């Protein structure tokens, strides 16, 4: 049994075992910086992942709310999904709030980012859950308010049914003039596939990204743990997108 009291040890020993090659870590850091994204297999042990997955499933069953909205601040891109907010996770969750404070996890991500990865200054963006479960469900084109986002693939169908991540790095989010279509025309799109058990890190504030809409009745669930930079702390932020989805 994995608990909030013994999880930080299990995270640190897995990181010490999985990421011993400094040359491998250097390539992962360079991938993250170049592409705004890097896949991180084995970021946590399978046993730690399965425990977090179980807690996420319990939180979905007791708190998920359906949304079907389009966000003007991201070019009217859709958010067709069911979701669980941070306040619900901080109240009835245990492993997820503890993992978010993991010094070992934030220390490894700091190696990749080449700067201090620390807690989000807005509590309601620390961790969220989304569940795509209908044909057409999608997390539309958007940026993030903060810098370092880790996505946990709790459940996912085969990629012929949707869910593919697409990214354009080294962009910016202008909430008054997002110009999403202009970004797609001016830059190539990189697509990344993921399956259950995968974790990936994404520079959300400068990487325009979305998930390809589900084309069938399938289930795709992710946990979003979002950390921030030092400049993010004193950053004047309005949270209109999070207020609408959560």
Which residues are 167's β-sheet partners? 190, 209
224 appears as a binding residue in the annotation: yes
66 is in an annotated binding site: no
Query: CA-CA distance, 75 to 53, in Å (whole number)?
Result: 32
> DSSP label at 146?
S
What are the start-end ranges of the H helices in the chain?
Answer: 7-18, 22-35, 46-63, 86-92, 95-100, 103-113, 180-186, 230-233, 240-245
Nearest to 103, CA basis, from 222, 5, 11, 232: 11
Point out which residues pair with 132 in neighbouring strands.
Answer: 220
Q: Is 183 annotated as a binding residue?
A: no
To the question of whether residue 220 is assigned a binding role by annotation, the answer is yes
Nearest CA among 126, 125, 128 for reference residue 100: 126
| Cα–chain center distance at 244 | 18
Q: Which two tokens stand for residue 9?
A: 């040890």
CA angle at residue 203 from 7 to 132, to 5 degrees?
A: 70
Binding region for succinate? 142, 200, 220, 224
């Amino acid at each position: 049994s994995i608990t909030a009291a013994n999880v930080e040890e299990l995270i640190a020993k897995n990181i010490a075992e999985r990421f011993a090659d400094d040359h491998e870590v250097l390539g992962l850091s360079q991938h993250f910086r170049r592409e705004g994204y890097v896949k991180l297999p084995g970021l946590v042990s399978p046993e730690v992942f399965d425990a977090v997955a179980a807690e996420t499933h319990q939180l979905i069953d007791t708190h998920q709310k359906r949304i079907d909205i389009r966000l003007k601040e991201t070019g009217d891109s859709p958010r067709y999904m069911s979701t669980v907010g941070q306040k619900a996770i901080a109240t009835d969750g245990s492993l997820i709030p503890a993992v978010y404070e993991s010094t070992a996890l934030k220390g490894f991500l700091s190696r990749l980012a080449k700067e201090e990865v620390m807690g989000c200054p807005w509590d309601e963006e620390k961790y969220i859950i989304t569940r795509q479960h209908q044909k057409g469900d999608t997390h539309g084109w958007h940026w993030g308010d903060f810098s370092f986002t880790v996505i946990w693939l709790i459940e996912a169908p085969s990629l012929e049914y949707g869910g593919m991540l697409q990214c354009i790095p080294h962009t910016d989010w202008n909430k008054d003039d997002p110009r999403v279509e202009d970004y797609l025309q001016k830059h190539p799109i990189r697509s990344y596939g993921h399956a259950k058990g995968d974790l990936y890190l994404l520079r959300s504030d400068t990487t325009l990204h979305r998930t390809v809409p589900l084309n069938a009745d399938r289930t795709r669930i992710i946990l979003n743990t979002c950390w921030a930079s030092r400049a993010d702390q004193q950053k004047a932020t309005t949270h209109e997108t999070m207020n609408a989805m959560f």
